[PDB]
A paper describes a structure:
V-ATPases function as proton pumps in acidic organelles and plasma membranes of eukaryotic cells. Furthermore, E. hirae V-ATPase physiologically functions as an ion pump, similar to eukaryotic V-ATPases34353637, and is composed of nine subunits with amino acid sequences that are homologous to those of the corresponding subunits of eukaryotic V-ATPases638. Thus, the V1 motor achieves its rotational dynamics via several conformational changes that are generated by the binding of ATP, release of Pi and ADP, and cooperative coupling among these conformational changes.
Next, we soaked the crystals of eV1 in 20 μM ADP, and the crystal structure (denoted 2ADPV1) was solved at a resolution of 3.3 Å. Two ADP:Mg2+ molecules were bound to the ‘bound' and ‘tight' forms of eV1, as in the case of 2ATPV1, and induced conformational changes with the crystal packing rearrangements. The eV1 ‘bound' form did not show a conformational change upon ADP binding (r.m.s.d.=0.48 Å). However, the eV1 ‘tight' form changed to a more open conformation (AC from ACR; BC' from BCR) upon ADP binding. We designated the new ADP-bound ACBC' pair of 2ADPV1 as the ‘ADP-bound' form. According to the observed conformational changes, the DF axis became tilted towards the ‘ADP-bound' form to maintain the extensive protein–protein interactions between DF and the ‘ADP-bound' form. The last conformation of the AB pair (eV1-‘empty'), which did not bind to ADP, also showed a cooperative conformational change. Specifically, Eh-A (AO) and Eh-B (BC) of the ‘empty' form were attracted to the DF axis and the ‘ADP-bound' form, respectively. The wider conformation of the resultant AB (AO'BO'') pair was most similar to that of the eA3B3-‘bindable' form (AO'BO: ATP-accessible state) among all AB pairs (r.m.s.d.=0.94 Å), and was thus denoted a ‘bindable-like' form. Based on these findings, we inferred that the structure of 2ADPV1 corresponds to the state of waiting for ATP binding (that is, the ATP-binding dwell) in the rotation.
Author numbering:
A (entry chain E): 2 to 226
B (entry chain G): 157 to 206
C (entry chain D): 3 to 455
D (entry chain A): 1 to 587
E (entry chain G): 1 to 48
F (entry chain C), H (entry chain B): 194 to 393
G (entry chain F): 227 to 455
The structure:
């Protein structure tokens, strides 16, 4: 593997690594700080023997001369498995429910690929959310992008959790899952979901990715991916 | 009775036309200079980085 | 140690090479080939060179045959007991053709931050002679009360009127008035100096004058000189000092100029990003101190660009100063002198200088009565011109008759008419006497019949 | 330590070479004087430093010494009943040594008293293995507070050498034997201010905080670990509110943080606070309070690092198992400093010139407050309840600071100037104000009191909300239409306005109100308008009852001043109102 | 519902003042309307 | 760009005769005063300055036309020799001095035109004559400085204008007004500034 | 290329040239393209700081010169962006040129041809331009009267459509009626109709005839009687 | 990027039959004319353009999916082959050419989609056919130009868009119109450009 001890400069959250080779755009890195602490980062741009990277946790407390940068040779991935059902993860797919670790079937770029417009199939199937205003007048369709426009104080939390547990598909499909994604929400807002999911048994049907307000901003934008 | 209608017209015309046209205008005016201010601030950073 | 190593000249900025031991903001002077001598200041210094900005401009300089000298000290001020009575410039040099003073010691005009636990809060009432200021928005020692004006609102007459009439009461301590002038037209400068001479206030005040054509780099130093002089009179001489600065809008315009010189990018509205802090550095230096009998009080004057408070100059000032005195165009164009509007005006520490021991025992009680009655009278006036005179209840009509009588006889005293506190208080009663005894619900049974005509 | 050398000085920016052993965000002493500074950037061995005091007189060649650590604080005995700045500099100790009433440049001095001797009492027994947070002994700094000395983070093992005696903070009062080696532990630990102290688990703030102020605890309660934003315009008496909160609230300690406030507002905080008295002990509140004070002309970093210093100290006593309440004022002045530091770094600005990370920076702060399970086998729990004040530009709550605050807090106490001259104390707008803990608190106060308290509160707010709409429509056609059925709810709401929402905090009884008192009080006014609604539906016009109920309206607000023990009168008020309308219902 | 674009800054605050005058005027004309109506209904009953 | 030395400087007391009822009555300018005429295009800024130049009670006038139309200047030289008005019994050209700088003339020459017209004014001021200088338009001077500031890639101030605009303008107006010349003959001379500002 | 060919035919060859340029807006767009390419310090809306000068070097290239019979007269056309008069391009042009002719959508939608809003428009050479010898002597007094009348009439019409026609005074309705008739016949004449200066003046009095003499304080009383209908 | 050559342009004087009452009657578009459809989301920009693709009296229709929804293109390749006009016996898909660069597809290729479709439209225009091209949406094209502009460190420009935005647009619509195709036949063809603008 590649381990480089040479960091040209550190400015804000951005770091510059010199004498580098075989590094790619959006490639993932790991910073081995002098105190043994390991921080993750991402390549923003690379030119010649130099690569500009951004550290997730931040560059605070790093001694350049005694820190090293390792390039993992792969972009930001996700370990996927069928055992992800019922589990709770953070913004980066790291477990959070303190359960057993998961051995991934494989790893996938969180960017994914674009569906061929030809290969696309028009939605054309009904989903029962339980809420009458939706299921009748503003029907949700399998494969549809149907958003909820809310406001501060408004019960969009209560509405989301409701749909999360109530929503099922008719025709008795034994396979229907819910992927719930939280982005930059407070602690109590996160606890509201995780508590309601467990007590209604909706957790057994759902995969949860929970990201908080105090969490790194990059983690917040990688959470939905 | 005639003057009531005149005054009623003025109140109605003032409340429905005049005031909302004022409020919505100062908002669109506020948004303009809000954008213009920072549209220049970015340019200035370019001047700074010459 | 004169260096003949001038490498660059861009704008007012100048570059000197091959130097050492040079400090930031260190004062310099450049000897030209013709012999002309100009001063400067280190705006930036690197390992083997330094950038300097010349006060007197950069016109007609030969880089090869000119030399620069480093004086090894920042902008300092000559402190002396024999300072009162004389007129100085922005840098401290005499302008009055008097005997050049021998200073006790030189001090950095930046000063130091006063310990929060050291601060002692002010109680003493200060009389300015102006009714609108001495009764409704009362000035207390060590307070920081600004004045908001506009281009052409008589803020220069009021400025003169204050220092002339400003006086401590009873207190056996002498009274110092450190006046500071910033980037003003000659006429305005000549106006103030003459006016302080004839009134004898010159022998009771210190003057720092700075014309408009004067270099911008010393326009910024002008207040720092005055404040340092004011701190030299209060904290090390035990005197109650009053500081007046004009213009403060001119201070910002000059503050902006040296920022573009440093090529610093402006933060908001074209003004630099340290405007609020830079203002606080020279504003928050006022007040009493524990153990010492000194006193520093500031009355900064600024012209709001096109009569707007939301402008960065008066807005940011509000977050620093306690209260504000606002002059109104509508008032001045109606012949009101001074054109002070008391409704938007405010003094956050007014009650500290009111009551028995400082003023008459009805001070606070009266103040709110005249104030509430004015607003009601103004509202009676606005409804009158829209619905006719008769639509008013005739006691709302007397509230209207009160509200214009209030401005014409109470607010309007004249720029040369002094009003002592007692003369102002019973004047309110004389106006409150118009109103019957039934509405005056802010005053109690001791005071209402002890003073009302 | 390695010494650096200044190679460039331009304003607040200072670059120095030979800083290879230094870290990013490290604190360092700059120049001959030794002014404090922060390492922002570093290329090769050349570190860029933001000097926080003025750099006049500083030039190239002068030394730069690194502290080896980022901005931290001293945590140990001698911290309570003290007043520092944003970076923990003892203002009274400052004055004593430097012999000045001012703050000079390059003046560094310890935060705690290292020469002072304390009596340590070892409660831990030699032989046991300790973990992070485990209490080893205690020192009664100032009762009410017992300063519980505990094991710092990053160390664990069996304790070998220990017993009580008189020591100072530098004296190794204990010895632990980790597998790394034998490290001794002093009774003081240092901790970075921009990093939260570790915990075992964060919990939900579900337990209401008893302030005694009716308007708060009933309609807008804040739980132990919650967060509340208060906008304080002048005249609203925000200072009166803060004092009452600091004194009456059932918290163990109080942390005050003054951020970049006026000079003529900060010494008020300084001098008026020892004047506060602690009810349970009858002694001054400062024996219970750590205070941070800064003014608008003090160094821009001290102003920015103010709330982080206080919250770190708050987290320290939080780990002891104590309930802490940190008060910040103003956070809007804090953000007006954070904005400036961004400008110096030439960062691309966000909304209204504020940094793009204003929300994150604010979120990082408030998320460090809350009910937690502190580290240690004892698994004790502590809490940090955050009260923060904002000062909007034009009373506008859509400004970035207030907006980002409400995004991460659940309680809003709006102080209205319009209610101030209406002599409404406290001046809290019951309409715009809200509390998301209200429902959870309702379930709590329902059970612990064993009454339908939540139903009473829900009824209280519903009546007041109707008063608003009634006032909008009563503005038209005057009192007409009389609407006695509506007009009744006004007299109830008018009552609800005076009896409960209004309370003079200087009146010996009207300044504090326990739960059972609040319950009995609101029960009167509720049952009044209920029995008043009874005679309304029975065909009796009601001004004829308004005259009969003159004898009870004299007691509904006398109940406000009714003493603690004498709730017997504050209970008979309620079945008395039954006979009054009944006697008037006979006519 | 936009009138015409007249972008100026002091014009904004003069517009806020114009707004408060309009509200003042609207307020005055509203309770003037009711007082004129007050006597109108009075006189109708005499009229009829 | 160097102010001609004086003994000392006086307060302008004597009102000028513009002939325009609006300004002579309600908004008067003294001999040696500083007047500004801000207004959009078509408001009559040039017309006013022409009307003041024609019927002023001063002894000499310096009409400085920088960055503005050429026809406006050819208009002046075609008519002023033909107009006659006291206090001079002769023509107006025997009283006026023109400094022409059209808008399509070189930009750097605009700042020159202003500083030359004021130096000629200071010259006759030192004699003891009352002189009035009309700067049309002063905004063109600023817009001229804005280009050179931009071309030098200098850090601009408000609206792109140089940060030293406020200081450079002050120098121009603090070089006018009623003063006494040098020597000991002590003749009084006044410079009245009628500046035309043309805000966007 | 056009203005050079104009000054060539007009001066060297003594011809009378009329210069038409459109769109003038697209010219300033081109300058900004090169300016943005050269990374130059941008003025308002990204346009070059030297826009006023460059535009002037075009418009000033017009007029007459001593001894030479020929003439070059210039009529540029620009589309105001955002329909905004304060935009850099129409602003700088207005400060350079000798007046401007302004079109309005309000008039154009009203079916007015040509839709020329006469109030914000201007000519800076109308003085020495018209009077006795070249026109009738009433030419100077008629336009100044029509201006003040339309200014009062149009504003009255505004008040009329919101507060009612019965809310105006009798003389207001006279101006309001005049203001409308002003637009429909005087301004609106069609794109293919040629009015001689005489017909226009004659029509001028006809339209302002419907007002009392006492209100017109801007026309010579001896001039009135002679030309008044 | 280079427009296909023609002999000369002609005035579009023949109105197009869209079958939409509001359009064909009150605001008609001629064959060779260009029409812009600015509107907020859900207003009907796409639906309108689909109607023109379905019923307009043209020989060919070239639909461009510029940075919009993928389902909106999938909806076309399915429904169009099932839409048969009664006379020909053949479907609508046998006269259309689809270009689809969706929103989540590479931004730079949005510009290519615009220029690819218009060139194909020119190819059949030269055959003497009447073609109609739909752009949905042109805003996403301009957004693509702004993206690459910032990467190239170019300077604005209005609202972040590059200074050459208007030119690119002007160049685009000028490629449409009634033309006389090259050749001895001097046959006539046309391109009618319908473009959806999506203002923020
Ligand atoms: N005082 C005035 N009296 C009569 N007409 C005037 C007056 N001022 C301006 N005008 C008219 O307005 C036009 C604009 O004149 P000018 O002074 O060039 O405007 P500006 O200087 O504001 O650009 C002139 O051609 C003239 O016809
Ligand atoms: N001409 C029309 N007839 C009927 N419904 C329409 C029409 N135009 C739009 N709609 C409705 O409006 C919605 C928006 O359609 P679309 O064209 O996708 O919006 P846009 O493209 O403007 O975002 C459609 O789902 C459709 O139901
Ligand atoms: Mg002009
Ligand atoms: Mg669409």
């Amino acid at each position: 593997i590649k381990e480089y001890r040479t960091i040209k400069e550190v400015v804000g959250p951005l770091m510059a690594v010199e004498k580098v080779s075989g590094v790619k755009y959006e490639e993932l890195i790991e910073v081995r700080m002098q105190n043994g602490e390991i921080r993750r980062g991402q390549v923003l741009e690379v030119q010649e023997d130099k690569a500009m990277v951004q550290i997730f946790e931040g560059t605070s407390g790093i001694n350049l001369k005694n820190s090293s940068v390792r390039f993992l040779g792969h972009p930001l991935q996700l370990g996927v498995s069928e055992d992800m059902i019922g589990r709770v993860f953070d913004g980066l797919g790291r477990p959070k429910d303190n359960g057993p670790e998961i051995l991934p079937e494989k790893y996938l770029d969180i960017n994914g690929e674009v569906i061929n417009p030809i290969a696309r199939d028009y939605p054309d199937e009904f989903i029962q959310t339980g809420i009458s205003a939706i299921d009748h007048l503003n029907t949700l369709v399998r494969g549809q992008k149907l958003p909820v426009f809310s406001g501060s104080g408004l019960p969009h939390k209560e509405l989301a959790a409701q749909i999360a547990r109530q929503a099922t598909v008719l025709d008795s499909s034994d396979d229907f899952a819910v992927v719930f994604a939280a982005i930059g929400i407070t602690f109590e807002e996160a606890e509201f979901f995780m508590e309601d999911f467990r007590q209604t048994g909706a957790i057994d049907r759902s995969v949860m990715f929970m990201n908080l307000a105090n969490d790194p901003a990059i983690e917040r934008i990688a959470t939905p991916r | 009775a005639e003057e009531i209608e005149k005054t009623r017209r003025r109140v109605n015309a003032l409340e429905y036309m005049t005031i909302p046209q004022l409020e919505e205008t100062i908002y669109y005016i506020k948004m303009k200079l809000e954008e213009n201010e920072r549209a220049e601030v970015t340019r200035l950073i370019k001047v700074k980085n010459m | 140690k004169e260096y003949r190593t001038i490498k660059e000249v861009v704008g007012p900025l100048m570059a000197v090479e091959k130097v050492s031991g040079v400090k930031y903001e260190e004062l310099i002077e450049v000897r030209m080939q013709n012999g002309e001598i100009r001063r400067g200041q280190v705006l930036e210094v690197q390992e083997d060179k330094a950038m300097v900005q010349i006060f007197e401009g950069t016109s007609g300089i030969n880089l090869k045959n000119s030399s620069v000298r480093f004086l090894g000290h920042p902008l300092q001020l000559g402190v002396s007991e024999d300072m009162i009575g004389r007129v100085f410039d922005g840098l401290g040099r005499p302008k009055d053709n008097g005997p050049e003073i021998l200073p006790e010691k030189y001090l950095d005009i930046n000063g130091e931050v006063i310990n929060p636990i050291a601060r002692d809060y002010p109680d003493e009432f200060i009389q300015t002679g102006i009714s609108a200021i001495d009764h409704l928005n009362t000035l207390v020692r060590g307070q920081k009360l600004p004045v908001f004006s506009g281009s052409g609102l008589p803020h220069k007459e009021l400025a003169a009127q204050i220092a002339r009439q400003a006086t401590v009461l009873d207190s056996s301590d002498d009274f110092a008035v450190v006046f500071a002038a910033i980037g003003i037209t000659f006429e305005e400068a000549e106006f103030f100096m003459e006016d302080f001479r004839q009134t004898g206030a010159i022998d009771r005040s210190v003057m720092f004058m700075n014309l408009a054509n004067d270099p911008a780099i010393e326009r910024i130093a002008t207040p720092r000189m005055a404040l340092t002089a004011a701190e030299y009179l209060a904290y090390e001489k035990g005197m109650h000092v009053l500081v007046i600065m004009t213009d403060m809008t001119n201070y910002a315009e000059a503050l902006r100029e040296i920022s573009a010189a440093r090529r610093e990018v402006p933060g908001r509205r074209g003004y630099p990003g340290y405007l609020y802090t830079n203002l606080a550095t020279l504003f928050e230096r006022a007040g009493r101190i524990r153990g010492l009998k000194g006193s520093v009080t500031q009355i900064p004057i600024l012209t709001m660009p096109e009569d707007d408070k939301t402008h960065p100059i008066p807005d940011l000032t509000g977050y620093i100063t306690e209260g504000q005195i606002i002059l109104t165009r509508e008032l001045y164009k109606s012949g009101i002198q001074p054109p002070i509007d008391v409704l938007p005006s405010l003094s956050r520490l007014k009650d500290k200088g009111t009551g028995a021991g400082k003023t008459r025992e009805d001070h606070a009680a009266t103040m709110n009565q005249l104030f509430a009655a004015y607003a009601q009278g103004k509202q009676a006036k606005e409804l009158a011109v829209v619905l006719g005179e008769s639509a008013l209840s005739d006691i709302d009509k007397i509230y209207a008759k009160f509200a214009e009588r209030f401005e014409n006889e109470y607010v309007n005293q004249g720029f040369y008419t002094n009003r002592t506190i007692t003369e102002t208080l019973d004047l309110g009663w004389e106006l409150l006497a118009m109103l019957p005894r039934t509405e005056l619900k802010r005053i109690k049974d001791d005071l209402l019949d002890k003073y009302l005509p | 330590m390695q010494i650096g050398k200044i190679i460039k000085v331009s304003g607040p920016l200072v670059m120095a070479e030979n800083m290879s052993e230094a870290s990013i965000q490290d604190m360092c002493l700059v120049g001959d004087l030794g002014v404090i500074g922060e390492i922002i950037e570093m290329r090769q061995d050349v570190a860029s430093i933001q000097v926080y005091e003025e750099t006049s007189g500083i030039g190239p060649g002068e030394p730069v010494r690194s502290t080896g650590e980022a901005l931290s604080v001293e945590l140990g005995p001698g911290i309570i009943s003290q007043m520092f700045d944003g970076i923990q500099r003892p203002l009274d100790t400052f004055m004593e040594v430097t012999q000045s009433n001012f703050l000079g440049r390059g003046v560094q001095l310890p935060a705690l008293d290292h020469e002072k001797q304390w009596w340590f009492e070892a409660t831990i027994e030699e032989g046991t293995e300790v973990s992070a947070g485990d209490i080893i002994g205690y020192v009664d700094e100032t009762k009410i507070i017992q300063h519980k000395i505990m094991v710092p983070n990053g160390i664990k093992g069996t304790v070998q050498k220990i017993e009580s005696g008189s020591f100072t903070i530098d004296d190794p009062i204990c010895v632990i034997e980790t597998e790394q080696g034998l490290k001794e532990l002093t009774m003081m630990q240092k901790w970075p201010v921009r990093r939260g102290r570790p915990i075992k688990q964060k919990l939900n703030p579900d337990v209401p905080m008893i302030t005694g102020q009716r308007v708060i605890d009933t309609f807008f309660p804040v739980t132990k670990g919650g967060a509340a934003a208060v906008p304080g315009p002048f005249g609203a008496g925000k200072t009166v509110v803060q004092h009452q909160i600091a004194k009456w609230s059932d918290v163990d300690l109080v942390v005050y943080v003054g951020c970049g406030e006026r000079g003529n507002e900060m010494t008020d905080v300084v001098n008026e606070f020892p004047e506060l008295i602690d009810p349970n002990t009858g002694e001054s509140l400062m024996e219970r309070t750590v205070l941070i004070a800064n003014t608008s002309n003090m160094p821009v970093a001290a102003r920015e690092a103010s709330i982080y210093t206080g919250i770190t100290i708050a987290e320290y006593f939080r780990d002891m198992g104590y309930d802490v309440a940190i008060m910040a004022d103003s956070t809007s002045r804090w953000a007006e400093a954070l904005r400036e530091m961004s400008g110096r770094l030439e960062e691309m600005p966000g909304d209204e010139g504020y940094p793009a990370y204003l929300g994150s920076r604010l979120a990082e702060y408030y998320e460090r407050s809350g009910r937690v399970i502190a580290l240690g086998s004892d698994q004790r729990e502590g809490s940090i309840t955050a009260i923060s004040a904002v000062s909007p530009s034009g009373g506008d709550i859509s400004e970035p600071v207030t907006q980002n605050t409400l995004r991460v807090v659940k309680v809003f106490w709006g102080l209205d100037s319009s209610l101030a001259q209406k002599r409404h104390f406290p001046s809290i707008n019951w309409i715009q104000s809200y509390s998301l803990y209200s429902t959870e608190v309702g379930r709590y106060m329902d059970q612990i009191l064993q009454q339908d308290w939540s139903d009473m509160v829900t009824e209280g707010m519903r009546i007041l909300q109707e008063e608003e709409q009634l006032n909008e429509i009563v503005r038209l056609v005057g009192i007409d239409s009389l609407s006695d059925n509506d007009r009744l709810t006004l007299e109830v709401a008018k009552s609800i306005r005076e009896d409960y929402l209004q309370q003079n905090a200087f009146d010996d009884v009207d300044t504090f109100t326990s739960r059972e008192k609040q319950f009995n009080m609101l029960k009167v006014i509720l049952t009044f308008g209920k029995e008043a609604r009874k005679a309304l539906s029975l065909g009796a016009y009601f001004n004829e009852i308004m005259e009969g109920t003159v004898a009870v309206r004299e007691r509904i607000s006398r109940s406000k001043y009714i003493p603690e023990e004498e709730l017997a009168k504050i209970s008979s008020i309620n079945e008395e109102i039954k006979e009054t309308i009944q006697l008037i219902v006979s006519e | 519902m936009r009138l015409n674009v007249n972008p100026t800054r002091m014009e904004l605050t003069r517009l806020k003042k114009q707004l408060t005058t309009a509200t003042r005027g609207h307020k005055l004309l509203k309770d003037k309307q009711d007082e004129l109506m007050r006597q109108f209904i009075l006189l109708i009953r005499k009229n009829n």
